[PDB]
Amino acid sequence: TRKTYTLTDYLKNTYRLKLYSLRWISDHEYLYKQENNILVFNAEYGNSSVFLENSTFDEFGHSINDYSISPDGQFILLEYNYVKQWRHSYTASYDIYDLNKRQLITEERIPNNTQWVTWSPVGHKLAYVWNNDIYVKIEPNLPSYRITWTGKEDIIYNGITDWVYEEEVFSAYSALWWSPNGTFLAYAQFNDTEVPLIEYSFYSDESLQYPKTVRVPYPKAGAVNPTVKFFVVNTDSLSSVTNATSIQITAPASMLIGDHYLCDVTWATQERISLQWLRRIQNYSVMDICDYDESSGRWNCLVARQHIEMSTTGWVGRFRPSEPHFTLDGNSFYKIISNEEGYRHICYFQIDKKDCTFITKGTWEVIGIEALTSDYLYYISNEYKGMPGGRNLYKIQLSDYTKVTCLSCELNPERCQYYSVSFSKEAKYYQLRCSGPGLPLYTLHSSVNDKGLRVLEDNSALDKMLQNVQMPSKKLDFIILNETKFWYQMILPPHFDKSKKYPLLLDVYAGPCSQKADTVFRLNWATYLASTENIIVASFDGRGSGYQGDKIMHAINRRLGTFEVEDQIEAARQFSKMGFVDNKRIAIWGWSYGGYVTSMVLGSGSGVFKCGIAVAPVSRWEYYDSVYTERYMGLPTPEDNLDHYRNSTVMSRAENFKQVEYLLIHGTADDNVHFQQSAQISKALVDVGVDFQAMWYTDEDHGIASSTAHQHIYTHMSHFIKQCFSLP
Amino acid sequence: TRKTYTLTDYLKNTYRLKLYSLRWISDHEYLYKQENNILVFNAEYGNSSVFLENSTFDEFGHSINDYSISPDGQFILLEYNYVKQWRHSYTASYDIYDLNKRQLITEERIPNNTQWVTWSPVGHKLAYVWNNDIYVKIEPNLPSYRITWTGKEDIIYNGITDWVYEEEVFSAYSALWWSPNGTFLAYAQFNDTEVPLIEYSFYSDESLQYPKTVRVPYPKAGAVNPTVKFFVVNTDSLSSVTNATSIQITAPASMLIGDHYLCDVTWATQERISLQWLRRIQNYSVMDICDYDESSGRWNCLVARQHIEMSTTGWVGRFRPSEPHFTLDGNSFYKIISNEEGYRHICYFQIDKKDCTFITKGTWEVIGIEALTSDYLYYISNEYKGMPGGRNLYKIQLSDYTKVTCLSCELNPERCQYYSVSFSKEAKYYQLRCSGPGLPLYTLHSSVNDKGLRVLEDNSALDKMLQNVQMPSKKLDFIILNETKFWYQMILPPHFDKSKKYPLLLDVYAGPCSQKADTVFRLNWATYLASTENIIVASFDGRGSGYQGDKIMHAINRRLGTFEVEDQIEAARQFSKMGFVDNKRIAIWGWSYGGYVTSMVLGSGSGVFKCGIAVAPVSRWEYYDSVYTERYMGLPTPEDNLDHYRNSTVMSRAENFKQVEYLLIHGTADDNVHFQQSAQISKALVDVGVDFQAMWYTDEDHGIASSTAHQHIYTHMSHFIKQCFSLP
């Protein structure tokens, strides 16, 4: 008896996971949505009031997609007409509402088709981007001040990122940074004038007679990259001059010699900004720390404050150089960098001294720095129990580094091993977000004494429901290879019995710094496959995976399509030798990098796998973007790494696909991994006479996240998997 | 005990039908290529001589695609560097070889990337089109005269057709017509200035980093059409000092009042040319007969010599107004037109007389006029035994229309019921090409007493091999629907046992004026399905089908996607009631128009079919080209026929696909039926949550004919059909 977790349950989302998303508006108050209306909460006592009743914007005539309150609480930014673009970019309309006089502002409005908008860090100043140009409003109802006049669609981007900077560098559309108290506005400018365009058809509703051709500047591996410049304007002078000057801060000579990237912007004080640059050969980066010269209104970065960060074994950072966290006075900062052993740790820097001091160490890594006060630095690491897949919050005493307290380890060790945190404005309070291995648990805490204030959401409602369902179990463990240990996890069917032979599906990602073996609780397709189809679903983090030191992460340096592919195959061998796996029913599947690796594995001729599914895969590195591809592969030229670029394609293994059952799937409007990539795979297969299954998804992008397509693709894949394992 | 016709046999052509393609060069001799050699045959006795050694160009360098001897046998055009474009268009390089002086002309040679070339009907003048302009060479080695200078890629076409005119009107790339003795050169000029462009990606070889975008002027239904002008230039009076003069012949006023097309051009004499114009609303056409005025130098088309052809029930002609066949003196002509009963017969016209006289009549139709002498007119019709799917050669005494003699009906009634013919210059001799129901038979005959001279090719070699294989049989019969008989054919498995239940596959086309039930012998996919898989393959010609009169053909006027779809379901319904059909295993498949009907059938909710396959189907008429679509559907505007355009889509029927298995295939480089069509279908299916099979063919067009793709698509569809029918 007791129903199992079925496909419909997953697709229809019957068993919902509750969460508690709050927004700190001060040092002890936060916002929270409870029944369409917005409540403000007093962190200290848990009491609240209705900040904005849901019926406030009833007769607005528009569905409000999101809202944003200015720092001073005097105004609220209403966003509507949301139109998604890439992963982070989108356009929308905006109206500003005056919270005091409870009126909606109807004059000097933010234009429609606005690309980005942000309040100043203090007060209620506004900066926005329209038609690729920057604008600043000192007051919600006053005319804007134009900052740039160069804006030009697909050519010059002021204050916003182009496709590649948005996707691979800043993971954001915005490229502007208000100084701490809002006086200055810094921004980047990108020029894609000579960047080659990716073009593909977009069909739209059937009412469109002629298909549309989407054209976006996108630099493939080895192609011409966009250039970039950085500026800073003093917004306090806008109302005093006709045309305020944007002062440029040039990149250091060590970068100007070749193609480079702006990879980080972080203010230190009211008059000090830090910038990190990265060479197109991403193994060398420089940080300039620039100060405002009040007598010249210029910005100067002293070479004595310049910091170099390079890697002899790979690229710099997990995906890019890490951000610095400055002490109040801006004279020192903390940054996560790889130590002599290859493990990322927190290094303490004096701004005008090149040698830093590590304040943490060990055979584990710091994930990120979360908060810094004058007494303590808080961070999340996977040190607890030597489990690279766990995450915990720690506190370290700035006056005595031997004093490190773990703030989350023992809170509920059996239910919570993967933590995330959110501090109030001055870090007086913090919300802990436990997301695994048990049901997510959200709690609020007081920083002054680290005492639990109360439980915010325990998901008791879901635990209630999950009691009447045969849920699968999860095993997180490791196997030893060449002395080093590699982690893996298994979603095991209910009432698992190791005396039996279960079919096994290898779920893979395996890209650089990836981690599929963790303690997070998930309700996904693997849940259904294990609970209903009694299939074991496994994942493995072999060479190239992250959070375990550069010896493992940089092993695939300049060699993608090798060790991370082979290790995935070896993983399957090890699992079968565990005795509860049916060597005759072993499948593999992956999306994105997972698809590439899955394809490479299905075409290796290993005989280990019976069938596999690749969704939106990369097929040859020269088809993917420069920033990401070159980071691990260097340049596709004969003097660099061309031979390996040409040796790591899926297409060259076409012939071996005769040994397996393959299902290739790709969205046609995929702007990230172009359909082109699967189009070349299918062609190579047709060319050598290989039969396989295929599915395209009209107008879907890399996420194939459209509600209907999402359900359609997981249904199609389920049939394929069930058939391959002949359940049925 | 004897093999069967396997899938590999069909894909590798192990069983080749022999042909005999000859080329008449006079009234008594023809050319035939044997062992790469070209021989000249004397029709009367059968003796031959070598005309050109297969080794004459043994050291030519390039691979010769094709040859073409000038009418006077003095020169030979060599074609190479062939590069295909659409259905008939291509560019190539040419070279001329002097047969007399056994030398290859090296001066003033045809340019590379030539779009079209042709000898004058007599002698050895040349006319070619390059970069959209027309050129003429009086002599192979002399410099050419530029006739036009307005030529512009994708914009102005002189002497060659644009996309729609190539595909739907002239079925050729050529748009120039030499006068009978080569004095005059007539040509059309197309302007696609305001024609929207269809755009789709082309991926090319794996090495191309960025997909290319193909753009071609293609008018979809209701869009802006290309305009056209007609010119005639005297090539006998060309000067190398002055730019050639082209005299324009404007269309009649009844045509200039609105959009229209030039649909036929046929010279009547050395100084008289005829042109047929067609209104955009394709049910009204006009023929002009224009004479050259020696003193004036202009071409005059007397209104008294105008001939109007219209239709009150549909469009004009089978696909377009038929071509006239003028008498020697050009004063009268014969032309196939629909008579008062709606049957296509030959009418005799006086050039300055409004009424024509039908010389044939009956409930059957003339397919084409093949030869005309002062005593007889030779034509092919399907009159014999009242079989609309049969074709025979007839001659009718021009002095007594009651004297009609069939020349092929009785030559071999059991083996031959479908003939084609090729007459020599003055109809002194004719070649008969029988293509069914038995193996193809080619014979030569003399007109004087209709003697059977000799057998050219009887395919006895193929017959010998076929006796060692279990070949299927063909049943051609008819069913009655409302006092009307409609024909069908069934390809029956070897040893057909009417006491057994066979699965059945409906092979459908069903387009307007289509015929899928004939007496033609074919070796195709259906042969393998029947011979090896024991599957009956049926085809049916319902309302909308051709060669049976307008009452049937015009049944679908302004109503595509209705009767022709309904009639296929009715046929299947009837076949499913026959004792030898397993009503639980009935499938349907089609390509092009057939893919549209197949999709409309699967989405009908009839419950008759278990599975179906659609290859490159049309999904909604507004996506297809204007000339073909509007011919049958009128314009897609509210005041015309928009409602039916919207009610006849595949998409609106998505929901009804839940009860069937559907496989949708399409080439991504299809310039005819754009990938868009299947893209909208898949998206609609996804939107209602209906699972299905799909396959795209990278860079393949509407014919998916490349060797690898051809083999791959039929392999994939075979797996699909066998699986649907539970066949090993």
Ligand SMILES: CN(C)C(=O)[C@@H](c1ccc(-c2ccc3ncnn3c2)cc1)[C@H](N)C(=O)N1CC[C@H](F)C1
């Ligand atoms: C998992 N994921 C989000 C990614 O893989 C995408 C990806 C996007 C952004 C980052 C990224 C960028 C900056 C950054 N600073 C700190 N972390 N951090 C991560 C890392 C990965 C990647 N651009 C992609 O879509 N493909 C597709 C093909 C290839 F596998 C990489």
Ligand SMILES: CN(C)C(=O)[C@@H](c1ccc(-c2ccc3ncnn3c2)cc1)[C@H](N)C(=O)N1CC[C@H](F)C1
């Ligand atoms: C079979 N065949 C060659 C066709 O169907 C194509 C087609 C092309 C040309 C003609 C055509 C044009 C002129 C003509 N003069 C005498 N016969 N004749 C036939 C008739 C049909 C059609 N343009 C097509 O490809 N689609 C695609 C979608 C729709 F089904 C029609």
Ligand SMILES: *[C@@H]1O[C@H](CO)[C@@H](O[C@@H]2O[C@H](CO)[C@@H](O)[C@H](O)[C@H]2NC(C)=O)[C@H](O)[C@H]1NC(C)=O
């Ligand atoms: C939460 O509850 C407390 C306790 O009632 C409220 O405290 C206010 O405290 C200020 C200063 O300490 C006093 O001047 C007020 O009298 C108290 N509020 C009222 C309404 O009297 C606090 O306002 C509440 N906060 C929220 C967000 O509801």
Ligand SMILES: *[C@@H]1O[C@H](CO)[C@@H](O[C@@H]2O[C@H](CO)[C@@H](O)[C@H](O)[C@H]2NC(C)=O)[C@H](O)[C@H]1NC(C)=O
């Ligand atoms: C963006 O970069 C392009 C170069 O890639 C710059 O364009 C050049 O501008 C100069 C100055 O007018 C011209 O002489 C060159 O011919 C231009 N080259 C090209 C390829 O266009 C452009 O100035 C930059 N734009 C901005 C705002 O910096």
Ligand SMILES: *[C@@H]1O[C@H](CO)[C@@H](O[C@@H]2O[C@H](CO)[C@@H](O)[C@H](O)[C@H]2NC(C)=O)[C@H](O)[C@H]1NC(C)=O
């Ligand atoms: C504000 O100042 C900027 C920069 O000084 C002006 O931009 C220049 O505009 C001129 C012509 O309009 C161009 O030739 C320069 O190339 C521009 N420079 C830059 C950096 O864009 C801008 O036009 C000024 N705006 C106003 C209203 O005066």
Ligand SMILES: *[C@@H]1O[C@H](CO)[C@@H](O[C@@H]2O[C@H](CO)[C@@H](O)[C@H](O)[C@H]2NC(C)=O)[C@H](O)[C@H]1NC(C)=O
């Ligand atoms: C935000 O920081 C800026 C920069 O320090 C402050 O502006 C300076 O204010 C001092 C007054 O102590 C003046 O002497 C300088 O001329 C100002 N510099 C500039 C560049 O404007 C600003 O006052 C701070 N804002 C707030 C609200 O404190």
Ligand SMILES: *[C@@H]1O[C@H](CO)[C@@H](O[C@@H]2O[C@H](CO)[C@@H](O)[C@H](O)[C@H]2NC(C)=O)[C@H](O)[C@H]1NC(C)=O
């Ligand atoms: C093709 O026919 C044309 C037209 O009838 C012939 O050209 C005419 O020939 C006569 C007799 O020589 C001249 O008087 C006319 O002036 C010509 N008319 C034109 C328009 O040129 C031509 O001779 C014939 N060509 C051949 C090769 O016989």
Ligand SMILES: *[C@@H]1O[C@H](CO)[C@@H](O[C@@H]2O[C@H](CO)[C@@H](O)[C@H](O)[C@H]2NC(C)=O)[C@H](O)[C@H]1NC(C)=O
């Ligand atoms: C040719 O076909 C057209 C379109 O069917 C006929 O024109 C009219 O079409 C509209 C609808 O589009 C009807 O309301 C009219 O009744 C049609 N007739 C007329 C005279 O307007 C047209 O009649 C047909 N021509 C011939 C010669 O049959």
Ligand SMILES: *[C@@H]1O[C@H](CO)[C@@H](O[C@H]2O[C@H](CO)[C@@H](O)[C@H](O)[C@H]2NC(C)=O)[C@H](O)[C@H]1NC(C)=O
């Ligand atoms: C076919 O045979 C005839 C003779 O039977 C060939 O001869 C005719 O043409 C020759 C030159 O082409 C002449 O030399 C003969 O005198 C002439 N004979 C007659 C009766 O006309 C003819 O050429 C042959 N044709 C081929 C293509 O071989």
Ligand SMILES: *[C@@H]1O[C@H](CO)[C@@H](O[C@H]2O[C@H](CO)[C@@H](O)[C@H](O)[C@H]2NC(C)=O)[C@H](O)[C@H]1NC(C)=O
């Ligand atoms: C081809 O057609 C175009 C129109 O479709 C002709 O140009 C016309 O349209 C122009 C703009 O589209 C107008 O400016 C003109 O009034 C008109 N003529 C010209 C010369 O522009 C164009 O001339 C045609 N070309 C030929 C060779 O006939």
Ligand SMILES: *[C@H]1O[C@H](CO)[C@@H](O[C@@H]2O[C@H](CO)[C@@H](O)[C@H](O)[C@H]2NC(C)=O)[C@H](O)[C@H]1NC(C)=O
């Ligand atoms: C068309 O192309 C061919 C090949 O390019 C030309 O022939 C010559 O080819 C040789 C090598 O094969 C080259 O060295 C020459 O430059 C080519 N041209 C000549 C004149 O020698 C041919 O000439 C071209 N003709 C036209 C009209 O484009």
Ligand SMILES: *[C@@H]1O[C@H](CO)[C@@H](O)[C@H](O)[C@H]1NC(C)=O
């Ligand atoms: C807010 O709106 C919800 C509807 O989403 C309603 O159920 C709730 O009672 C409202 N609460 C208030 C305070 O208006």
Ligand SMILES: *[C@@H]1O[C@H](CO)[C@@H](O)[C@H](O)[C@H]1NC(C)=O
């Ligand atoms: C934005 O669009 C709306 C809807 O058309 C329009 O009425 C409004 O005036 C626009 N606002 C601005 C600032 O352009």
Ligand SMILES: *[C@@H]1O[C@H](CO)[C@@H](O)[C@H](O)[C@H]1NC(C)=O
């Ligand atoms: C950076 O990487 C390139 C490519 O391998 C290498 O040649 C160069 O020496 C590296 N620089 C450093 C500091 O390791």
Ligand SMILES: *[C@@H]1O[C@H](CO)[C@@H](O)[C@H](O)[C@H]1NC(C)=O
């Ligand atoms: C001409 O060449 C072909 C193959 O290129 C060969 O089969 C044939 O024998 C040759 N012709 C003659 C007459 O030898």
Ligand SMILES: *[C@@H]1O[C@H](CO)[C@@H](O)[C@H](O)[C@H]1NC(C)=O
């Ligand atoms: C012919 O016409 C073209 C374009 O109209 C012109 O450029 C060329 O010079 C002319 N040649 C002569 C010989 O008139």
